[PDB]
Amino acid sequence: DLASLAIYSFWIFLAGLIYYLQTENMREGYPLENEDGTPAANQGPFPLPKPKTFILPHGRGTLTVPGPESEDRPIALARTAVSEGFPHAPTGDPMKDGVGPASWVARRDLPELDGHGHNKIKPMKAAAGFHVSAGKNPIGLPVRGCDLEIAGKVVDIWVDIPEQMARFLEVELKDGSTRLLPMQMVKVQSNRVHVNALSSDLFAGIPTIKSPTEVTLLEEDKICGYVAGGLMYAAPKRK
Amino acid sequence: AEYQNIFSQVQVRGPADLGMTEDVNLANRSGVGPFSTLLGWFGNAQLGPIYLGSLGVLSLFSGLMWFFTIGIWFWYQAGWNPAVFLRDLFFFSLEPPAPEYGLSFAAPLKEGGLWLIASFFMFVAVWSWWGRTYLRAQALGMGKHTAWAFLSAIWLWMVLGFIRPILMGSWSEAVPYGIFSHLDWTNNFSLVHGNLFYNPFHGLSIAFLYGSALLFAMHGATILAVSRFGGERELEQIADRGTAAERAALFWRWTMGFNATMEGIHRWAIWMAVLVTLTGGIGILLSGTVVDNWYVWGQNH
Amino acid sequence: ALLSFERKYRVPGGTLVGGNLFDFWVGPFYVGFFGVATFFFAALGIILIAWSAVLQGTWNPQLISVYPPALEYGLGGAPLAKGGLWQIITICATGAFVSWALREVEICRKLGIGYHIPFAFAFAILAYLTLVLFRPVMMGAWGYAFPYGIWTHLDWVSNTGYTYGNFHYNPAHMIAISFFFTNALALALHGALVLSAANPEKGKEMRTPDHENTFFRDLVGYSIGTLGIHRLGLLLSLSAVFFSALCMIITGTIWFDQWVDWWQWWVKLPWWANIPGGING
Numbered sequence A: 001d002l003a004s005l006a007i008y009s010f011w012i013f014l015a016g017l018i019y020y021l022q023t024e025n026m027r028e029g030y031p032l033e034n035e036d037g038t039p040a041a042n043q044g045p046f047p048l049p050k051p052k053t054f055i056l057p058h059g060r061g062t063l064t065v066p067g068p069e070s071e072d073r074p075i076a077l078a079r080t081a082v083s084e085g086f087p088h089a090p091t092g093d094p095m096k097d098g099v100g101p102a103s104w105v106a107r108r109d110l111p112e113l114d115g116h117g118h119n120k121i122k123p124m125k126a127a128a129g130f131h132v133s134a135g136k137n138p139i140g141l142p143v144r145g146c147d148l149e150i151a152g153k154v155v156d157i158w159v160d161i162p163e164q165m166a167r168f169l170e171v172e173l174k175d176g177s178t179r180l181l182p183m184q185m186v187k188v189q190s191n192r193v194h195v196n197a198l199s200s201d202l203f204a205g206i207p208t209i210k211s212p213t214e215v216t217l218l219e220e221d222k223i224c225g226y227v228a229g230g231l232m233y234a235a236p237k238r239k
Numbered sequence B: 001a002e003y004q005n006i007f008s009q010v011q012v013r014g015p016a017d018l019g020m021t022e023d024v025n026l027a028n029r030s031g032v033g034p035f036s037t038l039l040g041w042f043g044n045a046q047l048g049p050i051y052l053g054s055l056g057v058l059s060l061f062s063g064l065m066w067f068f069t070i071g072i073w074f075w076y077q078a079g080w081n082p083a084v085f086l087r088d089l090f091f092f093s094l095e096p097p098a099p100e101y102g103l104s105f106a107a108p109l110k111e112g113g114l115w116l117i118a119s120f121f122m123f124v125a126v127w128s129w130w131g132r133t134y135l136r137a138q139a140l141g142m143g144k145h146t147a148w149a150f151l152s153a154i155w156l157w158m159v160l161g162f163i164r165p166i167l168m169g170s171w172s173e174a175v176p177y178g179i180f181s182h183l184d185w186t187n188n189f190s191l192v193h194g195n196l197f198y199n200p201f202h203g204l205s206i207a208f209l210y211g212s213a214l215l216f217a218m219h220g221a222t223i224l225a226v227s228r229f230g231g232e233r234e235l236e237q238i239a240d241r242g243t244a245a246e247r248a249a250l251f252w253r254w255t256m257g258f259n260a261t262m263e264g265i266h267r268w269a270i271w272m273a274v275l276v277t278l279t280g281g282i283g284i285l286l287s288g289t290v291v292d293n294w295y296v297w298g299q300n301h
Numbered sequence C: 001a002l003l004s005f006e007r008k009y010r011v012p013g014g015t016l017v018g019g020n021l022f023d024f025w026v027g028p029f030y031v032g033f034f035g036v037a038t039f040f041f042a043a044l045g046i047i048l049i050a051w052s053a054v055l056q057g058t059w060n061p062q063l064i065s066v067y068p069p070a071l072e073y074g075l076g077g078a079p080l081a082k083g084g085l086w087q088i089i090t091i092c093a094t095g096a097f098v099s100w101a102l103r104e105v106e107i108c109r110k111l112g113i114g115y116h117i118p119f120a121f122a123f124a125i126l127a128y129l130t131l132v133l134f135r136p137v138m139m140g141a142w143g144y145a146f147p148y149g150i151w152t153h154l155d156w157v158s159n160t161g162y163t164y165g166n167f168h169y170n171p172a173h174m175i176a177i178s179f180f181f182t183n184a185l186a187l188a189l190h191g192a193l194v195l196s197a198a199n200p201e202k203g204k205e206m207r208t209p210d211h212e213n214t215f216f217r218d219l220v221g222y223s224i225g226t227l228g229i230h231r232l233g234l235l236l237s238l239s240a241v242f243f244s245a246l247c248m249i250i251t252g253t254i255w256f257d258q259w260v261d262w263w264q265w266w267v268k269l270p271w272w273a274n275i276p277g278g279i280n281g
């Protein structure tokens, strides 16, 4: 029967497709490790796929995966139990150490580039032609933390030029320096910008950028991880 | 209340983005269209520019001829009465030739000939458009995934109005051009072939269709959940994994025991969707050509 | 075992109930209070299905079928072998799904991410509940719910649908289908676009988001953007399920005749109802 052959054949194909898809999704994070960082005994029935190489634009090089995996940063956590499967407690201030929900990845310390080789993200004041086209302009508004205290004021919006969208709000603190806050983590209101994730006293702790006119992938991760980390770790200060 | 990032809070705009050049013939790109602040609350506010070379002109012309051919037939059935056109809009239908004409083109215009003409225009419109998906990607140096995926949809479409009718020996087997009529055709097709719920390829097609909604709901929600870490900038998370991709992976590893990668999830995605019409086309093509009654077939299998 | 980058995220906290009592993992799986709840509900449900199988007289996966109480029982209880088991299993399923969603919420809290996933899952749960709880309650009997059998639930779909003629005529059903088809269309497009940029022509450099926007503007004159496409995929899938639940909740309740006849309201509009010509004249 032709139909029988077809369906039998399809299932064989599907099993092979699933095998392929699963191995493709093991190009990051594998081999699996024990909590101490050494290779785990059981890796599962799926083997690692042959390496593939991505050619990155603008001379940024290449990326080959799977490849030797390493955090490339200290992880300030310690075991809380004598066997595997339990939580690992922060050895210091989790927000400052960048662990738990305040984690950041050691991404390349260079800015993401658009298709023309220019910085993808730029403060609006430096992005020729860009301006707020709809909604409440947050620039000039005071910034309130979850402790209901004002931590600063919005002095600019950092925009994704290629995709034309707001990505960060640049906030100036009392000492005159500024910090970037992810747009996804702020609530723009009529008379202010509210930040549920952080209490006023934690804004100074937000990681700073090296250059005032650009932000690297590494810095974005530290900034985003720190702000998000506040949801769990600033809870005591949150009203 | 926490901002959910479903709608943007503030829109920004800069010089119209004219796009990448690569090997594209700029002479064929129009100017930018207007900007929609309405659209901008959800997606990009920019309209255009669009690329329209010769192939594109052919596709649009042919596509419109298809649409107009059906429309003129509709007005005809409406007695050219505007009021009737609107009240019976969903009842009008441009039907294929009767079984008696087989696969010939000797059927009167009002009795199948016009259906063949509209179908010819549609055939040119779709295939030339497929050529467009391939060439626009080529001109930009991109992979041909879109054109390959589009082929899967084309497969079901081809089986329904071309391949199956030809194998069955008559155009009468094809789908009519009408809102309610193509639905009646669908119900009748299942009834006549012993209930499609018994066609294993129909069941698989359903699994993938439901699977597509499950997966896009999962993926869309995941990306939005990690957009606070730049998660939607997928190409760069692929080239340089960030905490967004790691948290997304762990949410699922911790939930269901396994996960994907920023690039891999898009492979699960393209296949989940593509298999909908791939299995579907096979299921329909075998109907009436190899299997007359799925219930019966299932009894012996 | 852990993914190479996993340990830094395995910290204490985020649980909604029990504090640190169930704050741990079993292999890759996070547990938590709701992980234990889900296991409890699921285990019981599966055990009750096996028992239903014994009362049915079969162990075959494609034959096992747990049916709800016959209509005569209305919304009351029923003997285990006559619909009661279905009733208990349904409670277990609901408990397992809701617990699964809440466990996802605890996982979101520990990871510091948005709650979009469990929120989206809640739509699927609500669709299930429309069919086994809301619709049956509104109609006056558990018997209107579908049976738990691989093939028998399809019999229910076919029978229920033809009870109203060709179910294609349900307007809410038409909208739901439109969202399902559009979603799959969008999923294929999204997967193909990202992949076409990440895996360009042989020897070339990875394309960028700019190239993705350019490809679609060149093709159809519009690109929704990377944030937008994920918002769209989510909206399309949830909308499809919302209209599915809606198309069924109104069937057998506010509308119970042949769906095709519903369309009479438009054709019978005073200003053209009697005008000669057309299909309806």
Ligand code: BCL
Pocket (backbone or CB within 6 Å): B202, B203, B204, B206, B207, B208, B210, B211, B214, C046, C049, C128, C131, C146, C150, C151, C153, C154, C157
């Ligand atoms: C929504 C409209 C109808 C309906 C209409 C149809 C139609 C029409 C079809 C199915 C089909 C299926 N349905 Mg149904 N189905 C309904 C409600 C359900 C429910 C429920 C709790 O709500 C479940 C679990 C299922 C499950 C299933 C799968 C067995 C099968 C593949 C679908 C799929 O992959 O989707 C996408 C989901 C995934 C890819 C995730 C993986 C899901 C796995 C496949 C489901 C396991 C189900 C399992 C056997 C239940 C036992 C588990 C316990 C341990 C006992 N249906 C409602 C009542 N269903 C198809 C089939 O072939 O059926 C024979 C089919 O054609």
Ligand code: BCL
Pocket (backbone or CB within 6 Å): B122, B125, B126, B153, B154, B156, B157, B185, B186, B187, B188, B189, B190, B191, B195, B196, B197, B201, B202, B205, B206, B207, B209, B276, B277, B279, B280, B281, B283, B284, C157, C181, C184
């Ligand atoms: C009473 C009716 C029968 C039945 C009869 C059929 C028939 C007959 C068919 C299906 C098919 C399908 N059925 Mg069924 N089906 C039944 C009940 C169900 C149930 C359910 C809960 O009961 C479900 C979930 C499904 C689900 C499905 C889908 C998996 C599948 C369609 C795939 C798709 O999206 O193609 C979407 C894609 C296309 C149609 C591709 C063509 C698109 C073209 C290429 C693009 C046109 C461009 C154009 C020129 C321009 C347009 C204008 C512009 C938009 C402006 N059926 C009952 C039992 N079903 C199809 C299939 O594959 O079956 C195996 C099919 O043929």
Ligand code: BCL
Pocket (backbone or CB within 6 Å): B186, B187, C097, C124, C125, C126, C127, C128, C130, C131, C156, C157, C158, C159, C160, C161, C162, C166, C167, C168, C173, C176, C177, C180, C240, C241, C243, C244, C245, C246, C247, C248
């Ligand atoms: C002859 C049959 C009638 C018909 C009768 C009906 C009836 C009756 C119904 C539909 C419903 C639907 N129909 Mg119809 N339908 C017909 C023809 C069609 C056609 C077509 C091409 O012709 C299409 C595309 C559709 C499409 C649809 C969808 C809009 C909808 C199903 C999806 C849904 O609601 O999911 C909702 C999602 C769920 C129910 C899933 C819930 C999942 C739960 C929360 C989790 C499961 C967990 C699991 C148990 C764990 C498994 C174990 C793990 C895998 C380890 N119908 C014909 C005309 N249709 C259904 C609807 O709208 O339902 C609300 C419905 O009831």
Ligand SMILES: CC[C@H]1c2cc3[nH]c4c(c3C)C(=O)[C@H](C(=O)OC)c4c3nc(cc4[nH]c(cc(n2)[C@@H]1C)c(C(C)=O)c4C)[C@@H](C)[C@@H]3CCC(=O)OC/C=C(\C)CCC[C@@H](C)CCC[C@@H](C)CCCC(C)C
Pocket (backbone or CB within 6 Å): B210, B211, B213, B214, B217, B218, B221, B255, B256, C038, C041, C042, C043, C045, C046, C089, C092, C093, C094, C096, C097, C100, C104, C117, C118, C120, C121, C122, C123, C124, C147, C148, C149, C150, C153, C237, C238, C241
């Ligand atoms: C917007 C709606 C769409 C959607 C979204 C969605 N689904 C989701 C999620 C989201 C966002 C998850 O986060 C969650 C997930 O973890 O995915 C991997 C999930 C999920 N969607 C699933 C299935 C599923 N989703 C479906 C549909 C959809 N999901 C929609 C299209 C369908 C169908 C039929 O279309 C199915 C089958 C599960 C794989 C998973 C949730 C897993 C879960 O809740 O596990 C807890 C329970 C158990 C392991 C045991 C249950 C045992 C018994 C207590 C009950 C079973 C009895 C009876 C109900 C079964 C009858 C079966 C017969 C009908 C054959």
Ligand SMILES: COC(C)(C)C/C=C/C(C)=C/C=C/C(C)=C/C=C/C(C)=C\C=C\C=C(C)\C=C\C=C(/C)CC/C=C(\C)CCC=C(C)C
Pocket (backbone or CB within 6 Å): B067, B068, B070, B071, B072, B074, B075, B116, B119, B120, B122, B123, B157, B158, B159, B160, B161, B162, B163, B175, B176, B177, B178, B179, B182
């Ligand atoms: C003019 O009037 C004004 C208002 C402007 C406009 C009015 C127009 C209106 C109201 C138009 C409405 C059109 C509608 C409702 C179209 C609906 C189509 C539907 C519902 C379904 C389509 C299914 C069609 C399929 C599956 C078609 C498949 C076709 C093919 C595979 C091609 C077949 C080709 C053939 C037979 C020709 C042979 C080809 C060669 C190579 C010579």
Ligand SMILES: CCCCCCCCCCCC[N+](C)(C)[O-]
Pocket (backbone or CB within 6 Å): A018, A022, A043, A044, A045, A046, B257, B258, C028
């Ligand atoms: C419907 C089929 C989709 C399910 C595919 C399931 C793949 C299971 C992968 C397990 C891999 C586990 N791990 C951590 C060891 O790699």
Ligand SMILES: CCCCCCCCCCCC[N+](C)(C)[O-]
Pocket (backbone or CB within 6 Å): A018, B200, B201, B203, B204, B207, B208, B211, B271, B272
């Ligand atoms: C790539 C996603 C893998 C999805 C695999 C889907 C499995 C669902 C199978 C149910 C179809 C059953 N059958 C025989 C009746 O067709």
Ligand SMILES: [Fe+2]
Pocket (backbone or CB within 6 Å): B219, B223, B234, B266, C190, C194, C230
């Ligand atoms: Fe994506």
Ligand SMILES: [K+]
Pocket (backbone or CB within 6 Å): A124, A125, A126, A127, A128, A129, A130, A131
């Ligand atoms: K500016």
